Each structure stands twice: as C-alpha cells, then as structure tokens.
Amino acid sequence: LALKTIDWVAFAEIIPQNQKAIASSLKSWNETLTSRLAALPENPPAIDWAYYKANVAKAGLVDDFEKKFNALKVPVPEDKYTAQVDAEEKEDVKSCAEWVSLS
C-alpha cells in the first residue's frame, strides 16, 4: 500500500476542459477511498476458538467450521487496470516531451 502523494492544485492546472468532471470525480473517489480505508482496520480479528471450544456443546460443528475457515482461499482481486494506465502515462510522456522540444 505505497501511494504517491499528490499536490491537488498541480493536478488542477493540467486538466483540459473536456474532462474537468472526470478530474473532479477522480478526486472525490480518492477522498472517499481514503476515508473508507481509514474506517476499517487491516486484518480481521481472528477470534480464538476458546469461547467456541468450551462454550459450544455441539458435536464438532465449531471444529469443522474452524477447519474449513483455516484453509479458505479468499479471492485476492488482481489489478488488471494499472498496466494500461502505465502505458497511457508512457504515451503521454512521449507526446509531452515532443511538444517540449518544439517549444
């Protein structure tokens, strides 16, 4: 979770007039996702089985639940979107350096 700190007026000076709404929406979603990552911790509290070993008088249901949970493969979502914005950044840097040599 290594993020790139961003100036928020420099981000504004570089936005053409056909995607001002898109820049504002990206900004709003950045703030929303920061707030939502702040309002939930990193790792769920793995509850000890103690309160469920010595307080459940049922035949191994707690035990098979804990076995099925210890070996669960929860799907980690893949990026599938950062590579293409990296390609777009490369293309944009190319165009910008060309225009700068013209200038």
Partner: protein, 52 residues
Amino acid sequence: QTSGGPVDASSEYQQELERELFKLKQMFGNADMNTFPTFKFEDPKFEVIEKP
C-alpha cells in the same frame, strides 16, 4: 431422573419456545445457520479513464 426425558418432566413449554426460537432465528438471520456459509464475491467496476 431425567434420562428418558429431555427437559425434566415438562409436558409443556414448547408452544411458546417455538415462537421464541422463530423470533431469535429471524432476528439473527434467514438462511440455514447449521452449515458453513458459501461466499459469493463481487469485483469493483472500472471505467474508461483513458485520456479522451
């Protein structure tokens, strides 16, 4: 002397216990709470952010 009986010679206390258990289950959930939960998962949407 409660081997042959579940609730120590009750002969009653089921007509209300079933309503109580109905309320308790329906306020804890609606699915079957005796089996492991299967997990449907979703993936966040994403748009055409590419520079127009």
